[PDB]
Structure 1
Amino acid sequence: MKQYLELMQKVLDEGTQKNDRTGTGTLSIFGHQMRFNLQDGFPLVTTKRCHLRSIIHELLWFLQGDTNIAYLHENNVTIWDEWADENGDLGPVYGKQWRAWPTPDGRHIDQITTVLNQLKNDPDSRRIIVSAWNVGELDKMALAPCHAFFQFYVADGKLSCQLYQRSCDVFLGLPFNIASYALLVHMMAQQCDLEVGDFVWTGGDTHLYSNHMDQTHLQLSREPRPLPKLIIKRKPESIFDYRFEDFEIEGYDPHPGIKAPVAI
């Protein structure tokens, strides 16, 4: 996508060398923002084939408040293998915080349910937020939340969402992340009888891994193509009742997928 490719190029031109916790090394910039009007098309990168099967199952997995990769494996999703433990646990990551953020007093808060009720009863609210950045549980997570905090907004009957990604693997993670949240917006909008607005992506430490340079140059040599159209074939009774079969992408004809090693 135009904005994705411009970011990729910006990291190459302006990024500075960094030595991350892994020791792989990266080129990094700090602070960037992109906007995707969801009515212009589903923001699924076309300069490389991105498989939605993994994106969709991970999101449904998050919404169920599950943090054990069992469900993912049952659908052959391996994106979370490199961080799960012997029992397939990741600790109180995304799913847990989204559906059951533990309060100091031993109880839990369901942020997704809160958000749905806010969108339906108080759409003008400036507090429609979901945060996975539970400071008190970071030490228990297999890894700290990358897509850390997001906010919804309603105007002119349209639902928008802004994501703050504190750390972003531009080549491997970003395409996945953008599609995941764009999808969530479509789902929320459907449950709230709203049209889709913009997905605003904001990044903190936005980087390209040193061992992703060849792939980056390859992708930058490719021209983006018209974005596909997301079709939801069934309207479930709640945001928690979606299933893989409900989603279908139309008119998606991307350049060939590009293989690249992930940093552990």
Structure 2
Amino acid sequence: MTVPTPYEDLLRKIAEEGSHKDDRTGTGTTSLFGQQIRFDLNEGFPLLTTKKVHFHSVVGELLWFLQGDSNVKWLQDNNIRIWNEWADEDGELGPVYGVQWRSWPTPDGRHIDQISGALETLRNNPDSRRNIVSAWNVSELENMALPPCHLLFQLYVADGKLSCQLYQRSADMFLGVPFNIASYALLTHMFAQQAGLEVGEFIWTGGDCHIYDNHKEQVAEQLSREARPYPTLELNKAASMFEYSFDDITVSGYDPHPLI
């Protein structure tokens, strides 16, 4: 009854107060800098209901991040086409997202697995104030098809509940952001579950938060709609952070407003 809409509120605020920039290469935006959206994960899985979000794509991109794979193959073979634009002829991206997550290179063999590291500190030292995972490796940036947008996150535990905050440097509010949210919300459910914890909040923090001019009307229509209760995440405990699979991950009671 009046479902919280912190994503739609930001969308709305940017449209009303954002600054307009125009290139003029036909890529006009209105934007705000340094904004935040928070969800209480216990009150529902934050897959938006004011338009449809393709959960299968969310799920599979995350799984692929988690494998440490710079090759787009497994994605194309599950009909996720998101990265296709950026791949070189052999399907390679250079060491984007999951390569940094799983194997940030040391000068000397040479891999730091931030994800195992994060989970282990969850288990042994949940009070840690340095439980952070970063993809923003300044010296590896030149090798990536492009530098990471969702670039760093931090874990936190209070009263047995796991919270996660994301720093995202650039946010296409209409197309990109609903996917980012679902996807880190799911990551945090994966951590909590493996660490034997409950879920707290997902906090999304944005740098340049922009609505493309070419999305003006789609935004006004999304914004004219009433939110429905969020769905609920059905997550089957895989053996480890790296052995989840599409079959473990469903959302139930998902009731999105129709296109467009």
**Do both proteins adopt the same fold according to a TM-score greater than 0.5, normalized to the shorter chain?**
yes
* Higher mean C-alpha deviation, range 163-172 or range 82-91: 82-91
TM-score normalised by the chain length of structure 1: 0.94
CA displacement 1:15-71 (0-9 Å, x = unmatched)? 112247975121111011111000000000000011110000000000000121101
Corresponding residue for 1:220? 223
Tell me the equivalent position of 1:261. none
Q: Distance in 1 between matches of 2:118 and 2:89?
A: 34
Q: Is the 8 A contact 1:178 1:201 kept in 2?
A: yes
Asked if residue 87 in structure 1 is aligned to residue 90 in structure 2, the reply is yes
Q: Please, which of 208, 212, 216 is the counterpart of residue 211 of structure 2?
A: 208
Give unmatched runs, 5+ long, in structure 1. 259-264
How much does 1:144 deviate?
Answer: 1.2
Aligned with 1:41 (options 41, 44, 48): 44
Q: Determine the structure 2 residue equivalent to 1:148.
A: 151
TM-aligned CA distance change 1:45 to 1:21, over 3 Å: farther
> Where does 1:127-206 land on structure 2 (aligned, <5 Å)?
127-206=130-209
Identity %: 65
Q: Which amino acid aligns with 2:243?
A: D
1:59 partner letter: L
Aligned residues: 257
Q: TM-score, normalised by structure 2?
A: 0.96
Shift of 1:13: 1.1
Residues 205-232 of structure 1 show CA distances to partners (whole Å, capped at 9, x for unaligned) of 0001111111111111111110100011
| Equivalent residues of 1:167, 1:203 under 8 A apart | yes
Instruction: Verify the 8 A CA contact 1:20 1:26 in the aligned structure 2.
Output: no
Question: What runs of 5+ residues in structure 2 fail to find an aligned partner?
Answer: none
SS at structure 1 position matched to 2:65? helix
1:65 corresponds to which residue?
Answer: 68
Bigger mean CA deviation after superposition, 36-45 or 211-220: 211-220
Q: Which residue of 2 aligns with 1:251?
A: 253
1:28 aligned partner: 31
Shift of 1:105: 3.3
Aligned residue number for residue 110 of structure 2: 107
Q: Name the CA shift for 1:22/1:169 in 2 (closer, same or farther; >3 Å).
A: farther
Q: Give 1:247's aligned amino acid.
A: I
Query: Which range is displaced more, 7-16 or 55-64?
Result: 7-16
Deviates more, 1:215-224 or 1:10-19: 10-19
Question: Does residue 1:237 correspond to 2:231, yes or no?
Answer: no
Query: Aligned to 2:234, what secondary structure does the other structure show?
Result: strand
Change (3 A) 1:28 1:114: same
Q: 1:13 aligns with which of 12, 16, 19?
A: 16
Post-superposition CA distance 1:147-193 (Å, at most 9, x none): 01100001110000000011000001100000000001111111011
Moved more, 21-30 or 41-50: 21-30
Name the aligned partner's letter for residue 197 of structure 2.
Answer: L
Q: What secondary structure, in the 3-state scheme, does the structure 1 residue paired with 2:220 have?
A: helix
Report the Cα distance in structure 2 between the residues aligned to 1:22 and 1:110, rounded to whole angstroms.
Answer: 41
- Mark the CA change 1:21 to 1:200 in structure 2 (over 3 Å): closer, same or farther: farther
Q: Which secondary structure state, in structure 2, belongs to the residue aligned with residue 43 of structure 1?
A: coil
